[model samples]
Target chain A: MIHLTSVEASVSFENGKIVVRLPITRPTSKIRVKKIENGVGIPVSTRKKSFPSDENLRDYYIEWQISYARDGKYDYELSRMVRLAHEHGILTYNDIYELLKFADDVKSYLEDKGIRRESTNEELYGFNIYEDVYPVAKKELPSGEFIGIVLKHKQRAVGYQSMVYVCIPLTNVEPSLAGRVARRNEVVKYEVPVDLMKELLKAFIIASETHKNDIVKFLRSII
Target chain B: VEASVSFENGKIVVRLPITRPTSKIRVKKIENGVGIPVSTRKKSFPSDENLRDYYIEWQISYARDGKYDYELSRMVRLAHEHGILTYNDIYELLKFADDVKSYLEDKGIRRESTNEELYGFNIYEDVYPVAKKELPSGEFIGIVLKHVGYQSMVYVCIPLTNVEPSLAGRVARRNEVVKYEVPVDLMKELLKAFIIASETHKNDIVKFLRSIIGT
Candidate 1:
């Protein structure tokens, strides 16, 4: 079975550049050793690179890039993905094909759950991502307002796993009252099994409902 | 045990005696219990009532080879004997202390030996009658303490109201003190100009400070 060894996903904006780094790690048995010419006659022996169970790790970088304007609406260009392999590491055409198939499978998983791209033409609040291929979903709470979820991937000890986080404001909270609840509710990550992406949609709904009640009570007492 | 203060090896070496200053006049109650706590402001007061008239109160300690010692008490006593422990005199003295601390810190002073919190103090010539400056968001009664040597450095203590109070008369009844440690280098010259403008009431102190600190 094609499985992941580890994965990492990071998104950030630096100096008008929106950079997304999604690196995946996998185990490989292939190893390449360089021979030393001077020690050839001395019967030079070498130890192969190995892991705990005689498996070696190889990394693949999935980079997404965008250029931001220094002024005006802070508009950004559409980001594109580029894959790179670690130095001196080998990846077969089959390996690339399997990973691409896996990524498509995950993408369809979100689409299967009725998760669609949110229109960014309107003013997006808190953690909203502009036009990008990185898939995001929205779930409407009981209170009409909806919570947004941005799907991400991370590497675990056993294999690669999917990560989901809220990308919208859940409660009507101010900066002073925010403290940390705003941030806590916004980017709280939920790790789910690869087969069970539906649970993440439920998580987003529950999180919004929980914070909505909290903010209401807080507003009542202040008045 | 007795402690001795000496200027040895380019350091104000205070032997033994562990230590720590500030000045104040009007302590205000702004809004909510959130602004600035009265207790924090009162704590800045000098313990000796005689030194109350003094503009600034300062306390400093030094450490060598991981041993801490207080040397401010001796210096305070010496200043009193010379009859020059007034506001201006103490201001100059406090600046000298800052210079000393900077010098010793450069001379391989052990981090553990030095008292980081009590390194310096805030003292002012006078704190005038309390007056509230109306802000677009809210009202604030602020106090500024200008540093001795570098007039650009200042300690800003703002007493304001809490937006939401937990209890009646328990929180909003008292003011909360929010202090900003804006030394000369950290804030640069703009901060100094803003503080001077605030003190003189020439410019909108609130607007000016907010612009500089981006609060």
Candidate 2:
């Protein structure tokens, strides 16, 4: 069941448990309210002057709710994220991963998403590279890998800076998905603040797998 | 009479009087070749074409001179011919002296490790790549393209004087003189569109000449 703040619903969580809340008073705090879909206002409280929206809603109550019979904190958040993600084509796993940080918390969300629980053994650059692969839709090329992974620098906490390596083999050659994807990949994977991709010669890493090793050799020759 | 230089099929004909009784005249011809500079032996002709009465002893220098520099007497003859020609025209003929010197230092076209730099160093000699086709005269024709060292990036003709049709493909680069085997009709059209053209509307020109290629 899903609920809208101040709106009606089918199934329910305890009024405050997994309920959608709204701030009818201040700057429309839409998504920030914890455990709320539309955001929630604390009943009878006015903690304004700063983040006023969460505490000041005197007029109407938010009435959106959903009960998926889920039992974990991660499950709760994952359910919300996945539901909201369809609107935005991309979902940063690292960012969304942060909000559901605890192992047990994550385990619960994995269970809710029905993802297989698999252990990654080798330390491929401080990450379980096995889980790094993500499926992406290939509108351009029918063949090739369409996935991405989160590569984190082990020096920091789980939420610290990281690189999102995406492989969109779909875009190839001139008018090429290669250049465009490389540019897009550079921006989303390396250029962005969250990116922690290993700095390498752009021309070399940008080629597809068959040519990647050769490109590296070529750069070594030049540099 | 004005001194004249006309080029036709790899043969450069330079016509100048034997010499001026007053001013010094030398005809220095700069050409690109590997290792050695080839010069023409100056042949003195009688000043008075009809009467052999007063035989002026006019000096003539030839390929034996060896070194490359602005030929003093030859340029005076060319200058005397142009009759105080514009700086542009003067350089057009003697750009080897006017521009090549400075351009060499900038592009580092000089002999690396030596102070005695050579001539024909920085000229974008025969640089543009070539494209060829049959000419309307049944003779294979050629055309060249290059920016004529002008301040603006406008391109100019670097026509191949002449060469066997087979070698056209082998000898062309970015800004250097180029040879193409375009048909005579197409060649004439291109000359009008390109050589005579002040505007470089490459697409428009290509569109206009589309029928020439029957494409």
Candidate 3:
């Protein structure tokens, strides 16, 4: 369970136990808080400034909540409860929706930066190093070794280069694997020169061996 | 025209009519008798077998009187035991020779001066390394002169008629020559200093050597 705060509200969560304290006087009656997938708010006697936890929320959550928080219908001092209920031991339906939305948003953002997705679904795309073509990718493994996938697309200039978009799916369905799972969908975007991209991918692959301490040692020597 | 020689510590050092200390001296001894090895090739003394130790050698061409060669190599093997005969020493001597020539030329001395006009010292004489210029009046020659006698010395005797008309007035005399009787190490020091001074031209090689030797 984690407690978070924002400029507009205080949010506290412990599994199903969730709370949101907004600013200003408590609402006179119960009101539905939109944008949080059917969130509802009720009056509370606690002053908005007196909430013990003021930990900030994630930017995506804050940005999404702002759309509903800006409305004048509910007093900003109302306490709201938004529950994130998992389905079949996986992300809630809302989580899946947000994941797809965020991924597409990221794709659009990278496109704005002149990095386009490669249009290919071929079963096999062989690369020849002798011919100056290469591939750079990453895959998450169950052994807590190297986790995450980065899709690398190439360009031809004085030599071949790449623009890589790293995509890490945020959650794991296996409850036992939950600790190892990445908690946030991460998108790290970067560009690499041809030879260096090859080395980076090569080093990453070598560093994927299960021993965490040895991974760093092996990576340093190779790179 | 005049020459003096000194032998010490198994090596012979000679001073000729040349104006400057000019260059270093080096000796190459043929290590093998059955098969002769060629001496180093230098721009100044690039030729074959002036055979020593059944092997030919090269010597510094400056201060060269066509006599230093035989003298330099004659006692070369004797001095080899003292580490005087090596490739670098020989090369230093050759470069010093060339630099001496260049130094004189830079000081308005011509390389191909007439031998007869300069009295006993030939134009290319190693002992008399300076170039002579005859004033409009041929009676007084303008030459860089070497004076050796009366306490072993050297100077750039200037404006021939003005300074000691009896000596520079004509050409140099044998009595005016400064002869050296130094060991191989002293010779190396002198020649190395000479080479360094000539290259920089900050100091006149002869004058510098004179000051150092208190001549």
Candidate 4:
């Protein structure tokens, strides 16, 4: 096992880049590790952790862009994350925590239904996108909107899950005016029974862990 | 709901779901009401004993949903979206919003767009009678291609509104018109020409930007 000896690690954000400085020496080996790596802030999804070593992240470029589309610059830090995660596989564990913790409702939901510690998030969600994904918000229009968590389960050998909440919007007279009737009709905005979406995440986990052979053998079999 | 400001490591930080340069909020009706009364949230409580229409609209608005959130979010987005990042720029922006919030009651202000988007770029927030140009070294973003002006082609950019944002070259004279989003860098220079061509020596937003721009 290689141990870091007298090392210093600091992470900072600068000029649209995630700057990571790891300065140290490896024990039991004469190899010196002194390097400064940068993440161009790429977007990495929940199922992949392809962000760490920028080189491990695909190289080469496409200069095809409409100058009017510098809008991508605003989201610069997000894309580099996939490239950032490609190198820091260990960082995957922390990324999911940050992603789930990104919202207040999720925080409360987790308090009610805590994580399953016995199984890995890989086991829970499938594969190891652990370090790949992060959270962000986008919005537009003259609208009335509300929030709910949308969960999906993938049926495949690899198994897949995309954990993002669906923000449903209603174009109505006014949200509150409608809420008046809902409120008067003995209905509150917090109308849902608790943990309604919690089991859905677990269901995805179970879906991942199941083998198709197990399903084929178990279904329509004689007792 | 309360203040999110905190001092850490000699730096001031406002946590998420909270606006910067934070302020405390107090609701009078909610404070006086008993529990979460239906009348407190949406149904307006009657204000007079003998009158049928004397409803306290303010209390109902507070109870139902925060209409004020639009104001706060606008200020927050204006500072963020327009790249108004300087410390002084933020200060001026905050002051501009604070002033708008008060006078907005007497007359609705800043529910429109001006094309020269920048800090304190509202026409209604035009406290000074004249606007002086400051930004420098840029070709015209929207030119007076075909023709006339009352005095000058005073370019103006304002904040968001439901109406489409367009560039108005002349206040009184008829000319040509072309409109687009004022992406900050080009906007920075277009604004300079605006400051110089117009006789006004003001726009608190521009004044603040002028000192720190390219600094």
Instruction: Provide DockQ values for all models, in the order shown.
Output: 0.01, 0.00, 0.00, 0.01
Cα lDDT tens digits, model 4, A2-80, are 5553322233343443343221112111112111124111222211222233342222111110010114331121122
TM-score of each: 0.16, 0.17, 0.16, 0.14
Candidate achieving higher lDDT, 1 or 4: 1
- Candidate 4 CAPRI assessment class: incorrect
lDDT of 2 by residue, A1-223 (tens): 5445332122213222222222223323221111112321232211222222323222222211222114532123223333333124233444334322321121111011111113345421111211212111111112321212111212211111112122221121112222111221111110111111111112112212322333234323222
> For model 3, how does the per-residue alpha-carbon lDDT over A158-209 read when each residue is reduced to its tens digit?
1212222211111211111112322232111111122222222222222222
Estimate, for each residue in B12-117, the C-alpha lDDT of model 3 and write its tens digit.
6555432222212211222321122222222122223422222111122223343322333333433444555554555545545454434332332112322331
**Candidate 2 structure quality by residue, lDDT tens digits, B92-116:** 3332222222110122111112122
DockQ score for model 2: 0.00
In order, the Cα lDDT scores of the candidates are 0.24, 0.23, 0.27, 0.23
Provide backbone clash counts, one per model: 15, 39, 22, 38
Q: Write the per-residue lDDT of candidate 1 for residues A1-223, one digit (tens) a residue.
A: 6565433333344233233322112211211112213311111112222112112111101111112122332222211111111011222344434333333333123322221233344321111122212333334333222223333222111111122231112121112111121221222221212112222223322223332232223222222
Stretches > 4 Å off in candidate 1: A1-21, A24-196, A210-223, B1-157, B160-215
Residue A54, candidate 1: Cα error in Å is 9.0
Predicted structure 1: clash tally: 15
Off by over 4 Å in 2: A1-203, A206-211, A214-223, B1-187, B195-215
Task: Write one digit per residue (lDDT tens) for candidate 4, span B1-215.
Answer: 33233333332222221111111221111122111112223333333331221111110010014232222223333434444434554454334433332110121111222233111111111111122222233212221111111232332222111012221121211311112232344333333333333223124334434334342
